[PDB]
């Protein structure tokens, strides 16, 4: 699709057998999601850096569908004020900025 | 242009007679820039909200060129870890997300 930016670019995703919503965020390097149960292995990762860090669980090669596009990428799972799809997964779906 | 997202979408801007660089950020509602001197009127605005708020100066109808596109929009001036072009100005330049 083509998504204009007059409103927040919130899209439907399917991850870990659940439907969720997340913000397509070109300002975010990584994809961070709350309340997802993923199988398979993870390692702790520190993200952010303002005021302290936030610890999240890093899962690599996670299957995820974003707006109907089935891709694979690293998903960080843990505390975030809004579910965010970062550049790491936007590249996978072939998302570009155009003007 | 078409901008892929393998690297941070950092673009050249011209604002207040200075060349600067800023991040095209679809996750940001507003455009926030550091170290710019703008003429004309402003009002204080509180942004963010995590850990407290950040106070910035809100300038409306600011002329700004973004990657060669001359537009007008609200610019918030004050403390930010990176210069950010938010949705408010991305709409103005006709920037869309495409996949």
């Amino acid at each position: 699709p083509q998504i204009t930016l007059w409103q927040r670019p919130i899209v439907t995703i399917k991850i870990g057998g659940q439907l969720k919503e997340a913000l397509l965020n070109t300002g975010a390097d990584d994809t961070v999601l709350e309340e997802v149960n993923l199988p398979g292995r993870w390692k702790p990762k520190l993200i952010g850096g303002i005021g302290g860090f936030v610890k999240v669980r890093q899962y690599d090669q996670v299957p995820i569908e974003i707006c109907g596009h089935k891709v694979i990428g690293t998903v960080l799972v843990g505390p975030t004020p809004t579910n965010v799809i970062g550049r790491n997964l936007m590249t996978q779906i072939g998302c570009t900025l155009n003007f």
Side-chain angles (χ1 to χ4, degrees), chain A:
Chain A
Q2 173 174 112
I3 300 176
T4 54
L5 294 166
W6 301 93
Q7 287 158 209
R8 299 185 176 167
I10 294 169
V11 299
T12 301
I13 69 171
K14 210 130 62 172
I15 177 138
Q18 305 157 59
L19 284 151
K20 281 164 136 37
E21 305 196 291
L23 181 70
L24 294 178
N25 190 350
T26 57
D29 299 341
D30 314 311
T31 290
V32 189
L33 305 173
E34 201 158 58
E35 295 194 317
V36 63
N37 214 298
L38 294 180
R41 73 163 74 292
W42 59 269
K43 63 181 188 279
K45 175 183 179 67
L46 293 180
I47 69 174
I50 299 294
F53 290 83
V54 175
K55 193 187 296 165
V56 301
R57 293 187 290 180
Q58 184 183 328
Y59 295 81
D60 298 321
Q61 311 192 318
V62 179
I64 177 167
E65 194 186 305
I66 300 167
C67 202
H69 283 67
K70 296 172 178 188
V71 291
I72 292 167
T74 299
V75 174
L76 311 178
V77 178
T80 175
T82 99
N83 289 338
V84 163
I85 303 305
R87 292 189 295 97
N88 77 300
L89 283 180
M90 280 187 279
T91 58
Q92 295 307 296
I93 69 179
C95 189
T96 55
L97 288 163
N98 299 78
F99 60 101

